[PDB]
Amino acid sequence: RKLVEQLKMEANIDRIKVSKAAADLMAYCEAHAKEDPLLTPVPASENPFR
Amino acid sequence: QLRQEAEQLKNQIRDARKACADATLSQITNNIDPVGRIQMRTRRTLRGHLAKIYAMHWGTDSRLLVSASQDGKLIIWDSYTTNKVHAIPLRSSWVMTCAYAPSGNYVACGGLDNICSIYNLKTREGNVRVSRELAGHTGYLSCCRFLDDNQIVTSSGDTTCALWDIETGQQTTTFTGHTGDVMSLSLAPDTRLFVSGACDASAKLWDVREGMCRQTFTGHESDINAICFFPNGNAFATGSDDATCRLFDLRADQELMTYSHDNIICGITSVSFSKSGRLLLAGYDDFNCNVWDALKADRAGVLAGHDNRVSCLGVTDDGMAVATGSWDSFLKIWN
Amino acid sequence: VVGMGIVMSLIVLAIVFGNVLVITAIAKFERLQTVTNYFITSLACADLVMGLAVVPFGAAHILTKTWTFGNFWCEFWTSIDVLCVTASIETLCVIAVDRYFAITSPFKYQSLLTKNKARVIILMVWIVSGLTSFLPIQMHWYRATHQEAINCYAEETCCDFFTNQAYAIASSIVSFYVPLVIMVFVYSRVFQEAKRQLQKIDKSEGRFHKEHKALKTLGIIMGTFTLCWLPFFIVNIVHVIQDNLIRKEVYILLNWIGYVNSGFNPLIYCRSPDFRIAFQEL
Amino acid sequence: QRNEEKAQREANKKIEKQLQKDKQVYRATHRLLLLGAGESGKSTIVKQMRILGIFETKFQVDKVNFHMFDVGGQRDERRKWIQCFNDVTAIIFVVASSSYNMVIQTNRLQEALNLFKSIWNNRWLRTISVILFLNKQDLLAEKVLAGKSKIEDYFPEFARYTTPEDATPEPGEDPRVTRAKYFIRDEFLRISTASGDGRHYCYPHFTCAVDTENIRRVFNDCRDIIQRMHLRQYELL
Ligand SMILES: Nc1nc2c(ncn2[C@@H]2O[C@H](COP(=O)(O)OP(=O)(O)OP(=O)(O)O)[C@@H](O)[C@H]2O)c(=O)[nH]1
Ligand SMILES: CN[C@@H]1CCc2c(ccc(O)c2O)[C@H]1O
Numbered sequence: 001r002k003l004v005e006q007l008k009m010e011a012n013i014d015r016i017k018v019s020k021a022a023a024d025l026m027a028y029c030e031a032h033a034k035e036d037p038l039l040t041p042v043p044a045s046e047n048p049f050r
Numbered sequence: 051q052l053r054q055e056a057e058q059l060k061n062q063i064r065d066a067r068k069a070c071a072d073a074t075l076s077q078i079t080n081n082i083d084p085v086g087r088i089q090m091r092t093r094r095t096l097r098g099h100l101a102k103i104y105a106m107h108w109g110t111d112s113r114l115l116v117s118a119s120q121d122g123k124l125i126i127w128d129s130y131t132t133n134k135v136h137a138i139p140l141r142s143s144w145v146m147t148c149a150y151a152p153s154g155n156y157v158a159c160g161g162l163d164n165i166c167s168i169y170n171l172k173t174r175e176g177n178v179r180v181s182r183e184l185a186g187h188t189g190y191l192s193c194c195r196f197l198d199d200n201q202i203v204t205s206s207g208d209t210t211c212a213l214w215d216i217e218t219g220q221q222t223t224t225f226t227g228h229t230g231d232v233m234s235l236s237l238a239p240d241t242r243l244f245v246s247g248a249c250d251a252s253a254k255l256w257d258v259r260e261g262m263c264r265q266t267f268t269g270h271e272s273d274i275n276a277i278c279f280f281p282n283g284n285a286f287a288t289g290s291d292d293a294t295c296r297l298f299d300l301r302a303d304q305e306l307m308t309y310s311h312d313n314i315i316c317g318i319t320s321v322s323f324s325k326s327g328r329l330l331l332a333g334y335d336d337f338n339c340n341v342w343d344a345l346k347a348d349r350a351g352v353l354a355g356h357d358n359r360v361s362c363l364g365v366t367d368d369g370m371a372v373a374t375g376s377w378d379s380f381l382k383i384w385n
Numbered sequence: 386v387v388g389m390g391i392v393m394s395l396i397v398l399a400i401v402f403g404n405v406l407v408i409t410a411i412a413k414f415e416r417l418q419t420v421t422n423y424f425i426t427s428l429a430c431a432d433l434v435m436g437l438a439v440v441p442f443g444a445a446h447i448l449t450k451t452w453t454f455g456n457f458w459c460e461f462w463t464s465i466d467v468l469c470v471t472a473s474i475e476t477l478c479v480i481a482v483d484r485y486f487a488i489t490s491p492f493k494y495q496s497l498l499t500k501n502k503a504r505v506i507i508l509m510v511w512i513v514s515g516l517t518s519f520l521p522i523q524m525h526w527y528r529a530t531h532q533e534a535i536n537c538y539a540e541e542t543c544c545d546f547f548t549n550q551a552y553a554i555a556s557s558i559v560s561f562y563v564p565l566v567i568m569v570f571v572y573s574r575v576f577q578e579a580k581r582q583l584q585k586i587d588k589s590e591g592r593f594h595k596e597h598k599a600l601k602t603l604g605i606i607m608g609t610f611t612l613c614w615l616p617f618f619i620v621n622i623v624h625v626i627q628d629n630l631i632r633k634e635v636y637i638l639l640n641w642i643g644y645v646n647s648g649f650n651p652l653i654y655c656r657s658p659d660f661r662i663a664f665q666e667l
Numbered sequence: 668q669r670n671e672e673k674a675q676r677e678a679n680k681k682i683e684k685q686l687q688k689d690k691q692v693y694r695a696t697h698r699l700l701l702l703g704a705g706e707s708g709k710s711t712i713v714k715q716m717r718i719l720g721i722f723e724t725k726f727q728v729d730k731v732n733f734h735m736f737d738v739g740g741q742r743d744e745r746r747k748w749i750q751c752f753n754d755v756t757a758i759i760f761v762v763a764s765s766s767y768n769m770v771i772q773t774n775r776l777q778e779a780l781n782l783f784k785s786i787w788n789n790r791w792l793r794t795i796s797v798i799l800f801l802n803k804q805d806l807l808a809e810k811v812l813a814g815k816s817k818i819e820d821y822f823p824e825f826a827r828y829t830t831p832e833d834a835t836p837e838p839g840e841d842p843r844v845t846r847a848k849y850f851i852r853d854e855f856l857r858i859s860t861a862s863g864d865g866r867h868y869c870y871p872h873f874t875c876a877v878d879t880e881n882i883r884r885v886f887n888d889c890r891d892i893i894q895r896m897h898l899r900q901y902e903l904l
Contacts, residue, residue, distance in 0.1 A: 004052055006227070007059040010265065011066075013303065019072040021284075021302045026079055026345055028282050029328045036326035037370050039085070048130055049093035049371060049385045098686055100693055101754075120751065121693060133675050134682045144721065144751060162748060163720040164740060189741055190748055207741065207748075231747060249747070357416055378416075484901060491893040492731050495694050579903045582895060586868070592831065593860040599903040 067304045075297075075306045079345045085328070088341055088351035090372065090384040094132055098125060102377035104361050105148040112366040115373060116157055117381065118148040124159060124169075129371070129383055138169055138178050151196045156181070156216075158202060160191035166204050168216055184214050186221055193234050197241050203258070205246055207231040213258065223261040227254065234276055239283045247274030247288055255300065267298050269305045276320045281327040289332055291317030297344070309342050311349065319361055325369025333360040339374060355382055386448065393444045400436025400648040404429045407651050410663040417659060421483060423503045425654055427510070428476040432647035435469040438462075440644065447637070452544035459544035460522060467518030471560045473647065475510050477610065478564040480654070485571040488578055517559055527552040553625045561618045565611075572603055609653060613646035696732040697889060700752045702786070703761035704779050708802045708876070709737060712761060716882050728886055735759075753791040756889055760786075760799045764851050765806035768816045776822075776851070784858050796867045798888050799855060800874040800881070804848070811847045818847060825850055848873065865899060868892075 033039060044050055101121040108115045114135065116126050122143040126136040144162035151157065160166040166184040173179065189207030196202050201222075205211040211225040211232060230249035237244045243264075247253045251270040254263045269288075276289040280297075285306075289295050293316060295309035309330065316335035323330055329350070330342040338354035358377040365372050372384040407429040411417050442462055446452055452459055487494045521527050528534065529547035537543035548556075579599045587595070617639040624631035703709040713735065717724050722737040741748065752758075760783065766775040786792065810816060818825045830846045831853070852871050859869035870888045874881065898904035 001052055003056050004059070006263070007056065007063070011059050011062055013265070015066065015070050015303050016301050017070050017072045018074070018299075018302050018304070018306070019078065021299045022073070022075045022078045022306070025075075025280070025282065025285060025299075025327075026082070029326060029345060032281075032326040033328060035369075036324060036328065037368070038088075038324050038365075038372070039326060039328055042370075047370075047385065049383055098683070100686075100690055128675075131672075131675070133679050135678070137682050137686070142721065146751075162738075162741070162751070165720070189743075207743065231743070231745075249745070488894065488897050488901070488903075491890060491897060496691075575903065578894070579898055582891070582898060582904060585891070588833075589868075589870075590856055590860055591833070593856060602902050 070302060071304070075345070076347070082345055084346065084348065085343055085350050088329070090351065090353055092355050092382050093371070093385045094129060094383040096127055096132060096381040098134060099123065099379035101379060102358075102361070103375040103379060103381070104146050106362040106364055106373060106375045106381070107148055107150045108364050108366055108373065109150050109154060110152050110367060111154070112368045112370065114154075115364075116148050116150050117375065118145045118159060119379065120144065124148065124157065126157070127381075129373075136171070136178060147191055147193050149194050149196055149202075151199060153199050155199065156196075158194050158196065160194055160204065162190045164188065164190065164206070166191060166194055166202070166214070182216055182219055184216070184219055187212070189231070192232055195235065195237050197237065197258075203235065203237065203244065205232040205235050209248070211235065211246060211256070225256050225261065225263070227263050228252070233274055236278050236286070238279060239281070245277055245279070245286055247277045249273045251290070253277065253288060253298070265300065265303060267305070269296050269298070270294070275318055278321050278323055281323060281325070287321055287323070287330060289318035289321040293317065295321060295330070295332060295342070307347055309347050319359070320363040322363050322365050324365060331363060331365070331372060333363045333374070335359050337376075339363065353384060356380070390444075390448055393440075396645065396648065397436060397440050397444070400432060400440065403648060403651045404433045404436065406664060406667065407655055408433070410660065410667070414663055417663065420498055420500055420503055421480075423507065424476055424480050424483065427507050428473060428480075428650060428654070431469055431473040431476065432650055434465075435473070435644070435647050439466055439469060446544065451542045453542070455541055456544070462544075463546065464519045464522045467522065467556065468514055470643075471517050472511055472514035474560055474564055474614070475514060478567050479506060479510065481568045481571045485575060488575055517556065521552065548625070550625050553621055557618050557621050561614060568607075572607065576603060606653065609649060610646065613649070614643050617643045696734055697756045699733065699735045699757055699759055699885070700755050701735055701737045701759045701761070704763075704775070704782060706766075707761045707763045707779075709761050711876055712800065712802070712874070712881060713737060715876075715879060719879060719882055726882070728882055731886070733885075749789065750791050753795065755795060757892055758786070758792070758795055758797045759885070760797050761802055762800070763803045764801040764848075765803040765810060767818055767821055768810070774821055780854065780858065783855065787858065788862055794866050796892050797859075797869050798885060799869055799871045801852065801871060802874050802876075804873055804875045807847065808844045811844045812841070818850070865904070868895070
C-alpha cells in the first residue's frame with residue numbers, strides 16, 4: 001500500500017543526461033583546482049602546522 | 051493487486067534510468083592529466099585519551115576540534131599548539147558520535163543510552179554543564195549534525211531519523227522508510243536536504259522542510275558505513291564494508307563511478323572529500339587510509355601512520371589539513 | 386694466535402649488533418614502551434657497554450701479551466669489568482621477580498608495578514652495582530700481599546688481577562650467588578602455577594581434546610645463564626681458598642665463556658612477535 | 668601576545684593532572700557483559716548479586732572493583748553494537764536449561780545454541796572468554812522426573828548418549844536427572860571446543876535462583892582468565 005504510493009512519486013521525476021552531469025562536475029573541479037592547498041603543496045611560509 | 055502493482059513500477063524506473071546513460075564518467079575524463087603522487091606527513095600528534103576513539107568533528111574556525119572516547123571523556127583540542135582546552139566527563143561510557151556547533155557555543159554527544167546531550171561551552175560564571183537531554187529514540191544513536199544554534203538532526207538504530215528542537219526538546223518531524231539501522235548522515239551545504247545510509251544497502255535523499263523522501267539509490271552490496279556530499283552539492287559518495295566506494299549523482303539519479311581495488315578486502319569506516327572536490331580520502335579496517343582520484347578512480351597516495359583500525363576522518367573548511375582517529379587513542383594531523 | 390684474532394672479531398660484532406637493535410626498536414616504536422621493557426633496555430645497555438669497552442681491550446691485551454696503557458687505565462678497565470658484570474646479572478633477577486608477581490597475583494599486579502617504581506628499582510640496581518666495583522677497586526681496598534702481586538703492581542706493562550680472600554668472596558656473593566637462589570625459587574613457583582592451570586584445563590574438557598611448553602622455556606632460560614656463569618664463580622673462590630690449584634689459562638677461558646652471555650641475551654629475551662615485526666620493519 | 672600563551676599552559680597542566688588521577692581507577696576495574704535470551708533469567712541473577720537505555724551495576728568483592736553491563740532497549744536480530752565490547756574481561760551467558768520442549772518453529776534451546784555459536788565465532792570477539800550459567804535447574808529436574816515429556820522427541824541424538832564417567836553429582840540425586848543435566852552442558856562444550864585454540868575458553872556452571880555463590884564463581888573465573896592470559900603471553904602455556 002505505502003510502497004505503491006511511494007514509488008509512484010519517485011517514478012515521475014525529470015532526469016538529465018549523464019554526459020551533462022559529468023561535464024558539470026569536471027568543470028567545477030577544474031575551476032576550483034587553483035585554491036586547493038592539498039592538491040598543490042603550499043609554501044612553507046603560510047603553513048600553520050609547520 | 052497491490053503486490054503485483056509494486057513490481058510494475060520497479061521495472062519502469064530502471065528503464066528511465068538506462069535511457070539517459072549517454073556515456074560514462076570514465077570515458078569523458080580520459081584526457082585529464084593525472085594528479086600524480088600525493089604524499090602527506092604527520093605534523094601534530096595528540097595524546098591523552100585512555101581508550102579507543104569513535105568520533106571527531108572539526109570546528110568552523112579550522113583550529114579547534116572535539117573528540118569522543120569510550121573511557122567517557124570529551125576533549126576539545128587546539129591543533130595549532132597542541133593544548134587541551136576542555137575535558138567534559140560523560141554520564142555514560144558508551145559514546146558513539148559527537149558534533150561541534152557552527153557558532154562554537156555548544157557541543158553535542160550521544161551513544162548507546164539512546165539520548166542526545168548538549169553541553170553549553172561558553173557559559174558565564176561556571177564550567178561546562180549539560181544544557182538539555184533529548185530523548186525519544188528506541189535505538190542507539192549513530193550520528194547527529196547541527197543545522198543552527200537551535201536545531202539538530204539525529205539518526206538512530208531504530209531505522210528512523212528525527213529533527214529536534216533544542217529549546218523545547220520536541221521532535222518537530224520524523225523520517226521513516228528504511229528497513230535497517232541507519233548508520234550515518236550528512237547535511238547539504240545550504241542545509242535544505244540531507245542523505246542517510248542504512249544497513250539495508252540503500253541511501254535516500256530527504257527534505258528537511260517537508261519531511262518526505264525524494265530519491266533512493268541501491269547500488270551497494272552490503273552495509274553502508276559512511277556518506278558525504280560533494281562540495282558542489284549535486285553529488286555524494288558512499289563507503290560500504292565490501293571494500294567499495296561509489297559516486298552518485300542526484301540529477302542523473304544513478305551511479306557514476308566505483309572506487310575499488312583487487313588487493314583490498316577490508317571494510318571502509320569513513321570517507322571525506324577535499325576542498326576542491328578532486329580528491330576522495332577514505333578510511334579502512336586495515337589500519338591505513340587511502341587517497342583516491344574523484345575523476346579517474348586511480349589511487350594517488352597512502353597514509354599509514356596508525357597502529358590500529360581507523361574509525362574517523364575529517365577535513366578542515368579551508369582545506370589545509372586532514373585529521374584522523376584510530377582505536378589506539380591517538381589523533382594525527384596530516385598536511 | 387693468528388686464528389684466534391679472527392674469531393674474536395665476530396664476538397665484538399655480535400654483542401654490539403644484537404643489542405643496538407633492541408634499544409632502537411624500543412625507542413623508535415611507542416607500542417613497545419611498557420613497564421616490562423624498561424628492564425630489558427637496562428640489560429641491553431649494560432651488555433652494550435660491556436661489548437664496547439671490555440672485550441676489545443681484553444682481546445688486545447691477550448693478543449699483544451702486554452698492557453700498553455699505563456696503570457690508571459688498567460684499574461679503570463677492571464672497574465668497568467666488575468660494574469658491567471654485576472649490573473647485568475641483577476637485572477635478570479628483577480625480570481624473574483616481575484614475572485612472578487604478574488602470574489601469581491594477577492589482580493594486584495597493575496597497582497604494584499607502576500611506571501614510577503621501575504625507575505627507582507633500576508637506579509637502585511645500578512647504584513648497588515657501582516658501589517661494588519668502583520669504590521673498592523679505585524681506593525685500593527682489594528690488593529693482594531704476595532711478592533708477585535706487588536711486583537706486577539709496580540710494572541707499568543703488567544696489568545693482572547690479584548685479590549685477597551675477603552674481596553673475592555664478597556664480590557662473588559653480591560654478584561652471582563644471591564640472585565641465583567631468588568631466580569630458582571621464583572621459577573619453581575611459576576612452573577607449579579602453570580602445571581596447576583594445565584591440569585584444570587585438562588579436567589574441564591578432557592574428552593573433547595603435558596607441561597612441555599613451560600619446561601622448554603624454563604630450561605632454556607635457566608640453562609643458558611647457569612652454564613655461562615657457574616664455573617667462573619666456582620673457580621673465583623677455589624683459586625683463593627687453596628692456591629697453586631688453578632692455572633691462568635683456565636681463569637681466562639672461564640671468564641671469556643661467561644662474557645658471551647651478554648651477546649646471547651637478546652636471542653632469549655626479545656623473541657616476542659612484536660619484536661620480530663619491529664626488527665623486520667628495519 | 669605572550670600574556671595569553673601563559674594561561675594556556677596553566678589550564679593545560681590542570682587537565683593533565685586530573686587525567687593522571689583518573690587513569691588509576693580505569694586500569695584497576697573489570698568490565699563484564701551480561702547476555703542471554705528471552706525469559707532466561709538475566710534480571711533475576713543480577714538482582715541477587717547487587718544486594719550482595721542500558722543497565723549498569725557496580726559491586727566490590729575482596730577489594731576488587733567490578734562493573735557489569737546489561738544491554739536493554741536495543742532488540743535487534745543483527746548486532747552491530749557488539750563491536751564495542753571487544754575489550755571486556757569476560758562475557759556472562761545465561762540460558763534456561765529447562766526449556767527444551769517450548770516452541771519459540773524450533774525450540775528455545777536450539778535458538779540459544781544458535782546464538783551461542785554466532786557469538787563464539789565472531790571477528791571482534793576472538794579473544795573474550797565466556798562464563799556460562801545454565802539456569803533453572805529445579806524445573807529441569809521436575810520435568811525429567813515426570814514422564815510427561817522426553818528429550819528424545821525434540822533432540823533425537825539424546826537416545827545414544829551415555830553419562831560421562833567423570834562427574835560430581837549432587838548428594839541424593841538421580842541418574843536420569845544427572846544424565847539430562849550433563850547432556851546439555853556437553854552440547855554447549857562441543858560447540859565451544861571446535862573454534863578457539865587457547866585464546867579463549869568456556870566455563871559452564873549449573874545455577875538456580877536460590878543459590879548465592881554466583882559472585883564467588885565470577886571472581887574465580889576472572890582470576891583464572893587473567894592467569895591464563897599471562898601464562899600464554901609468557902609462552903608458559
Ligand atoms: N521457580 C523458579 N522460577 C525461576 C527460576 N529462575 C527464574 N525463574 C523465573 O524467571 C522469572 C523472571 O525472570 P525472566 O522471566 O527471565 O525475566 P528477566 O529476569 O527480566 O530476564 P529476561 O527475560 O531475559 O529479561 C521469574 O518470575 C521466575 O518465574 C528458578 O530458579 N525457579
Ligand atoms: C678479571 N675480570 C673480573 C675478575 C673478578 C670479577 C669479575 C666479575 C664479577 C665479579 O664480582 C668479580 O669479582 C670478572 O669479570
